[PDB]
């Protein structure tokens, strides 16, 4: 993991006074950072954005060597209040270092979600440490909330941020600037055009270890069957073959996949923009110094970039609608698009209802504002990167060392846009039929693990697809037994709507219970009666016995599935169990369950 040379030197050579660092798992903090960097130019300053994993942040002590210098951290919080994977080296440095940051000016925008226990843990930490190390905060810590609207929190913070920067440094605010230039390739050889590979040219057709985010392994789809019994939704079990990939995983780990966008959606964007999507091109950085040569692997076709490199499905952010406004020939449509970027009033409210709440993707916006006819080259520079999708691996490597199993609900909903929207990755996984049907993937290691000693009892709470990793856990616990190992009680609390609708792994779980692999199979059918039966109803019922396992057997409790509501209700039930059988007050119950649910006991998403 070889760091770039000093970022202070880079910015000294390039004539930049502001650097903006992104802690980003799924690219939102990265987008915020590039926007702040560009923003610099409109205030007589020069900005760059940087991936902190690539630099040694100790070079912060050198940043005062540059006049009227400033560092901004856009820091997403991931996991159970941990840093993003790219921010982990920064985090571990901040803890260990006692460097003197005297004369360093800083500001932090945290990206977080209130529904999560540790709201912007990473934002707040970074903000606090730089101070403790002797750096001067030039503007208040921003607490962005994805639970509300994060975009609107960024608008509000940025709008106040720049005036204060201008005020402090004694500089003054002063027109569409493009980051990249279009180059069309007429006479290009087929063998040097990217076709959806993420890393090296021909990484896909030409597979060579080691496999990771930058070089995903193309795993063959062994299996892909309907799990759910009814037709109400589509829940799907997939087995990916990682034979000869040299990939190592444990139960509780995550599998990331790189999907393709819907063909019809891509062609429609092309048709409505009157564009030739089969043109071969590059968008090359106009700043010849930046290592970011292109916004995505180039040269390549618009069709390819729209299929594998670009997000064409999520509600576009305000700066993308703002940049497009110029290409709207009807003054009213130009006005709406321009005002999407307001921090207040009618424009903000239109952006929240018409774009966000209605889940309008770029194509819908082009259709509903027919006067908006951008050129495909700028659109492709503006759209964000298509991100990998993570899934809890539904198999144990002890049992299935050459296969990675996925348990997923297909996303397909009716939006206020009047359109039916489709999950990019789930629609694409669904269409994979068992040359071979190939899925670019890699493994991200998690802290979500079985207890070290087999005698330790496990309690697993995993309604709906929340069961994904517990299938692995149960496979593995079953395996230890049949290897003559001594295994504690193994308790599954699972949930679904009906026995005959969405009872995932019904046959497989019946089996495990008969063999003794599951000590108890407790299932809550939330719609087999007038009232809701949920997992925390079964938890409260088993309160006496669950306390025995927790207090006397040091049982590990695992909780996977919906972050918003399920995980909070489950935790309140555990607080209520501890408070009875301690005894102790509610305050000490909460301390107790917090200490029990240490990093690697919650696997939550929403
Ligand atoms: C660590 C982790 C583990 C995960 N494990 C699993 C797993 O085991 N199984 C699983 O199925 N998924 C899992 N997910 C979710 C997964 O990553 C994907 O987000 C999910 O499969 C949908 O991706 P997609 O590309 O199909 O949808 P996308 O195209 O990315 O769309 C997702 C968005 O659709 C919108 N949406 C969905 N339904 C509606 C609705 N009714 N109304 C309005 N908007 C709606 C929401 O805005 C949501 O953010 C996990 C996620 C993480 C981060
Ligand atoms: N607007 C949106 O963005 C939106 C809307 C829908 C789904 N989603 C997402 O899509 C996924 C749905 O997948 P899934 O099949 O795993 O979920 P699911 O089937 O809807 O949930 C599984 C089970 O959990 C139960 N449950 C619901 N609320 C609960 C609570 N507070 N406590 C305990 N149990 C509860 C459900 O009962 P009941 O359903 O009968 O209550 C059901 O039996 C989730 O990740 C969800 O966040 C998003
Ligand atoms: C698996 C997962 C875990 C998360 N954990 C936290 C958390 O512990 N605290 C928090 O405030 N936000 C949490 N979030 C919310 C994210 O910080 C938020 O979505 C943010 O915008 C992600 O930014 P990024 O795209 O740059 O990664 C989590 C999101 C996911 C998907």
UniProtKB/Swiss-Prot annotation:
Residues 18-162 form the Flavodoxin-like domain. PROSITE patterns: FAD_FR (PS51384), FLAVODOXIN_LIKE (PS50902). Its EC number is 1.6.2.4. NADP(+) binds at residues 233, 465, 526-527, 532-536, 569. Binds 1 FAD per monomer. Binds 1 FMN per monomer. The keyword Flavoprotein applies. FMN binds at residues 24-29, 76-79, 111-120, 146. Residues 1-606 are cytoplasmic. GO terms for biological process: carnitine metabolic process; cellular response to follicle-stimulating hormone stimulus; cellular response to gonadotropin stimulus; cellular response to peptide hormone stimulus; demethylation; electron transport chain; fatty acid oxidation; flavonoid metabolic process. Its main location: endoplasmic reticulum. It is found in: Endoplasmic reticulum membrane. FAD binds at residues 359, 389-392, 407-409, 413, 423-426, 605. GO terms for molecular function: cytochrome-b5 reductase activity, acting on NAD(P)H; electron transfer activity; enzyme binding; flavin adenine dinucleotide binding; FMN binding; hydrolase activity; iron-cytochrome-c reductase activity; NADP binding. It is a single-pass membrane protein. One of its GO terms (cellular component) is intracellular membrane-bounded organelle. This enzyme is required for electron transfer from NADP to cytochrome P450 in microsomes. It can also provide electron transfer to heme oxygenase and cytochrome B5. Belongs to the NADPH--cytochrome P450 reductase family. In the N-terminal section; belongs to the flavodoxin family. This is NADPH--cytochrome P450 reductase. It comes from Rattus norvegicus (Rat). The gene is Por.
